[PDB]
Design a protein around this ligand. Structure first.
Ligand SMILES: CC(=O)Nc1cc2ncccc2c(-c2cccc(C)c2C)n1
Length: 154
């Protein structure tokens, strides 16, 4: 009862790229770039594809940084999200009907307009730590319970 997703963070030494989602799941928040892994597709290939579709950027090197499972009470399917980061990209970010990308200085990450769990694991991401997390949500705004631990192997 878990569905595979990817999430990609473009993280450079002084800034991170986030995309304001205009519609659908996560609309109105600054998100990384991700989505469902397809049939016959590797998780990493899925991550590379989502980054291109949503941001217009071509990734070169992708690095595994975490796994987060999300539970929404009242929803049977868990999201099994494989989180990646990259500092090595081609292209310039593209604004589309679906997504408005913007660069943020690392001290100006807009956590109040991001998914609430980001506040918990972004600090780890920023310091190049790897992690496993689980967040139980009620609706899209309330974290009921969570676990988060650093790991050596994602
Ligand atoms: C920084 C960031 O994006 N954080 C972030 C936080 C999330 N929190 C809860 C559920 C999903 C989240 C997602 C997410 C992950 C993969 C696919 C999709 C559609 C979404 C909404 N991303």
């Amino acid at each position: 009862a878990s569905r595979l997703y990817t999430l990609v963070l473009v993280l450079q030494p002084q800034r991170v790229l986030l995309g304001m989602k205009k519609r659908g799941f996560g609309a109105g928040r600054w998100n990384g770039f991700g989505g469902k892994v397809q049939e016959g597709e590797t998780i990493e290939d899925g991550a590379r594809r989502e980054l291109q579709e949503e941001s217009g950027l071509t990734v070169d090197a992708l690095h595994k940084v975490g796994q987060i499972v999300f539970e929404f009470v009242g929803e049977p399917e868990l999201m099994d999200v494989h989180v990646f980061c990259t500092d090595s990209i081609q292209g310039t970010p593209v604004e589309s009907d679906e997504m408005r990308p913007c660069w943020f200085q690392l001290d100006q990450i807009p956590f109040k307009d991001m998914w609430p769990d980001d506040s918990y694991w972004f600090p780890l991401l920023l310091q190049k730590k790897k992690f496993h997390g689980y967040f139980k949500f009620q609706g899209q705004d309330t974290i009921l319970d969570y676990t988060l631990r650093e790991v050596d192997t994602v």
